[PDB]
Design a protein around this ligand. Sequence first.
Ligand code: AGS
Ligand code: AGS
Ligand code: AGS
Lengths: 614, 121
Amino acid sequence: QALQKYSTDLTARAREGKLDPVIGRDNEIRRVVQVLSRRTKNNPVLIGEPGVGKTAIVEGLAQRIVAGDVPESLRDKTIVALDLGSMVAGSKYRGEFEERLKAVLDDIKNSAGQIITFIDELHTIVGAGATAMDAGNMIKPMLARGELRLVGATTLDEYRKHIEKDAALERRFQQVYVGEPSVEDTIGILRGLKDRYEVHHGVRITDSALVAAATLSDRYITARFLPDKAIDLVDEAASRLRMEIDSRPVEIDEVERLVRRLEIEEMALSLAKLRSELADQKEKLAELTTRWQNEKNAKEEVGPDDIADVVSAWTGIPAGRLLEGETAKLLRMEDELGKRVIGQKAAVTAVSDAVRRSRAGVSDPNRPTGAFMFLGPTGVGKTELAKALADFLFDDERAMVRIDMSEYGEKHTVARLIGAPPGYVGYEAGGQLTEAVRRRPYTVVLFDEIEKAHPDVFDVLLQVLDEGRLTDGHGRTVDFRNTILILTSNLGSGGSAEQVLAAVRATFKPEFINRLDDVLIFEGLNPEELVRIVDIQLAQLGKRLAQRRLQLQVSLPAKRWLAQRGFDPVYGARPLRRLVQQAIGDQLAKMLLAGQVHDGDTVPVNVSPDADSL
Amino acid sequence: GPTGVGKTELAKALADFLFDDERAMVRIDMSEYGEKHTVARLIGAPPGYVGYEAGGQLTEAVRRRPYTVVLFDEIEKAHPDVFDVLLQVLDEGRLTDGHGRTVDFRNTILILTSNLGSGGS
Ligand SMILES: Nc1ncnc2c1ncn2[C@@H]1O[C@H](COP(=O)(O)OP(=O)(O)OP(O)(O)=S)[C@@H](O)[C@H]1O
Ligand SMILES: Nc1ncnc2c1ncn2[C@@H]1O[C@H](COP(=O)(O)OP(=O)(O)OP(O)(O)=S)[C@@H](O)[C@H]1O
Ligand SMILES: Nc1ncnc2c1ncn2[C@@H]1O[C@H](COP(=O)(O)OP(=O)(O)OP(O)(O)=S)[C@@H](O)[C@H]1O
């Protein structure tokens, strides 16, 4: 009766059908039965990386014992799962634990070879009674005679920390190595569990969802292992579907809550403004509502789309079908990007191309998406281009990772981006390039001024470009599969179009230029196109003055006089920004803090033959 | 040999019919070991120091399944101290770590890549 209170049963639960059907892995089952039926030293320890199924094998053995495919030897054995937490429960007195354990063991030894014990997580055997080691190695003279069959299941790396420390126990246990499967059998494992999820959520799951979630989840979520990493998408997609069985969908709830919020704020202020955005949002919410009704007049199952929406929600790399939500943006993308960068169109199209080939799935699945270096003279706008394609992909400007290779003058500064080896000073922080990516892995990475780095940083990114893995000091292999790398330079500012390709080849190696994508050349500027830069700069400086709601009224002769002063094409578009302040800035500053330009109406600017007044 | 020839594609193709996959190989990259103290990430750390119960990255990926093929990509850039660690790997088959176990490389297929010269006659 001592086994009754301190231990449950599995075979009695298996006869009632409370275990999920265990599919595949006949080799490990036959190996466990082969180990388990020998004469002496008969207890397997299932060992593998966590998640691959090491309790499901024991439940499959329970299913086979209840069914009856076992041989004559293991005939009707009734596996009993023990505990180690409900035995050290209250034992503050001196001999209170030890007679308890010895009573359990005498009950196991008493019966006629029936009971096969099953301790899960057996690394807790070692530190049992903290008195001077007495407990845990009490069962050591009993395992050698083969008296309790003791099937266990511990992980791989919690084994050489505890059990290999105490190697007198280590030779009692045999070992069964359970490695993960591949996709080709994980599809078959998924297809058999598609009954219990229909019960707990009364919905229907298409087979296309399973063959998608096995294939799609192995490129994106790389922190888990193959069986455990693919069920969760199916379950959470079923929950996504069951949430919307409430009378409305999601967008309508979102919009209702949003407009209620803006309503609240607005009425509390009683700002205009919001008044408009209210109305617009009320138009939208109206339209959708009507659409909803329409549809009703005319969903209840999951498909291969909602799996992709789960994977796009978590680890926020979007990986859907492009269901028209951004297709109008991805066709108006060269047009949108040419609102902040003017000209250089032959290398704007070449960057738009490396995204539009990759949203539609044509590019190589295991290689970084965009890994290319663009260069030219100084002032063209090659840094402003990089901060303007992260502007509409992310609605951000600091979500990119700007790391700067003008500080890496010496050789040994490489370690600040890969972290210290194990045993030295900083071994908690890891890398700095690694740990910035491993959370939110979709950002854009810069490398400003690749010139002035020492020629040893180049041999670290030689495996970043081609096969997108990188290993930090710990051993977490982070992967740069779907980021966008950017390299800048200044080599050969105004030399030629062929001298510039003679200094690039002379500084790098014939194994590093080949790793790259298309190496681009930014051109110079033109005196005709300089006016449109002045337009954007004055628009920016007019937007800045919303602190005190002034604006500017600018005449065309001023707007072209500031363009005709954009001289010296050694410097590019940079000195025009200084010219804007030396004409308009300090003049308006002196005009401002002497009173008299209190906020409200703007000022007019006007030329006066050499300078310009206000 | 020279670059762009197929010297990495070969070492991933003979790991294809031995294992029925292409990701079950020990792929370490020695393009990062420019200095003399990145030995410790593949050999462990001596006892008494910070990361002690971690093993090495080369060591505790063999002792589990002692049959995987091992790469070594771009061995030129390693400082000539990593070669000293590699010297008893060859022709004996065993090395040590902090815990004091001699892991046996007696039946794996070591593979070394390089790009030296790249066009010598
Ligand atoms: N062959 C299989 N047949 C049926 N279900 C499986 C199979 N392999 C894995 N599973 C399921 O995948 C999950 C694996 O969970 P467990 O194996 O219990 O966790 P674990 O793999 O033992 O990891 P730890 O270390 O015990 S937390 C469960 O939901 C199992 O039902
Ligand atoms: N083509 C352009 N279109 C719009 N603004 C531009 C353009 N070129 C330059 N500018 C402006 O001038 C600034 C300088 O551009 P930058 O890209 O910083 O110069 P650069 O390309 O970094 O050259 P180096 O060699 O890196 S200093 C930008 O931040 C913009 O404000
Ligand atoms: N003879 C070949 N047969 C098939 N594919 C080849 C052949 N030669 C090259 N390739 C392809 O070339 C690409 C790159 O070859 P890699 O071997 O990866 O480069 P590499 O030969 O290692 O040179 P380095 O020094 O590493 S840059 C791969 O996609 C290979 O498939």
